[PDB]
Chain length 115, copies 4
Amino acid sequence: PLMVKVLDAVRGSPAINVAVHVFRKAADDTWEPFASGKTSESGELHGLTTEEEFVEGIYKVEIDTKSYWKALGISPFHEHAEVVFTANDSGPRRYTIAALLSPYSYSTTAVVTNP
Amino acid sequence: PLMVKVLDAVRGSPAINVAVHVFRKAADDTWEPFASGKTSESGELHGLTTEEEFVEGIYKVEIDTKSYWKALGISPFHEHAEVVFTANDSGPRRYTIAALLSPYSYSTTAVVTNP
Amino acid sequence: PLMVKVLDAVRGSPAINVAVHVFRKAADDTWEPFASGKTSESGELHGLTTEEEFVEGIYKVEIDTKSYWKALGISPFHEHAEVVFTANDSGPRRYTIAALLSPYSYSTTAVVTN
Amino acid sequence: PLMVKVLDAVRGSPAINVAVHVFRKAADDTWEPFASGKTSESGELHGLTTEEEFVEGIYKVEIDTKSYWKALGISPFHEHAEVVFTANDSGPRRYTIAALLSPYSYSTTAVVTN
Ligand SMILES: Nc1ccc(/C=C/c2cc(Br)c(O)c(Br)c2)cc1
Ligand SMILES: Nc1ccc(/C=C/c2cc(Br)c(O)c(Br)c2)cc1
């Protein structure tokens, strides 16, 4: 129900081994850790959560773009790329969060489907 | 060896039934029709060409964004989104051309892999 | 030293009257309010800070995109857009944080000049 | 009535000294030269046309991104970036075509205002 895909605009490639952390806003307004993982060789991160676990809420997907760039030997501008959204509030949906990275820029889009 | 994927930034969905035309620059500097098709329900267009057919050259991928938006009842800014690039000049590669559409904007990226 | 510019990809216009908050990362890793305002008719927000006040560190620029889209009657995806970056004195002196908004997407870039 | 602004997503800067050609679509569907120039230190290209000369029709803005990246020693994907649009008198009067460049990607938006 939640997939993250990351691409590299410099190399024209998937962004591999990118760390991703997902948080969910708690009742006390803090960000509770929800799930995390690493993008694969395809730039995709599968298996973050389950339909059971992925309840309604406000979620933050933090993509650790700085660590990615530094590993390639590049000093980038941003610390991370964030995506903050309400999920599943009209029932379960499937979300893909895609991000396209450059050293001084990023872009993100959501693909939301109703199974 | 050549795949086109198109997403809708307004709807948060694949861009379905988007017409795509591919041209190749001829010896006389004109744009020769090469291949064409329509994106599927996934926003993907597969089967445009073959490794045999897809020789070195300068290719133009024209995504008919205006027709897409007009079909949804929207008057968009651009006539089409173009992607013009040299392909296969250091041997066969696999190219994905991805585009993300809004009524007054688009973005495109290439994912190039060496099989 | 810090300007924010916001554009609307749906209407093909500056994004006008958008609330923007800037935070600075504190020692305890919390986000402390630093500066804020609303974009002008040109989509720009000037006068956030001064050379004196804007020191090296980690900053977060939060753009209230959800209110923006609601006010235009358009259904949005994100709660807000965030841009988190380090200000570095060895690079150029003036930072422009630009954002391009769609309902289910946004893009941001930095234009850092002297 | 027509301005072009180009930014560099790799360096976080305006894209300076980039060649830009504008064409207008002719009756025979061919592309006729209309205006051209090079971006300034701010990444902007002003003075392309006048209100008088800029009539409704289909225009193509070609940005020579390949030369730009080559001059910086960076390997590029695209031959050029294109932006093809219709000028419509029922909409606002001033058009800004903005482009954000990376080696394997670009983004473009229109800012159309009165
Ligand atoms: N600017 C901008 C922002 C995001 C994107 C997404 C590309 C994208 C490519 C593949 Br292939 C794919 O499977 C998915 Br899902 C998404 C492109 C351009
Ligand atoms: N993805 C994407 C596409 C386009 C842009 C444009 C940024 C932009 C910056 C400044 Br300063 C300016 O004056 C104008 Br007019 C436009 C940003 C991100």
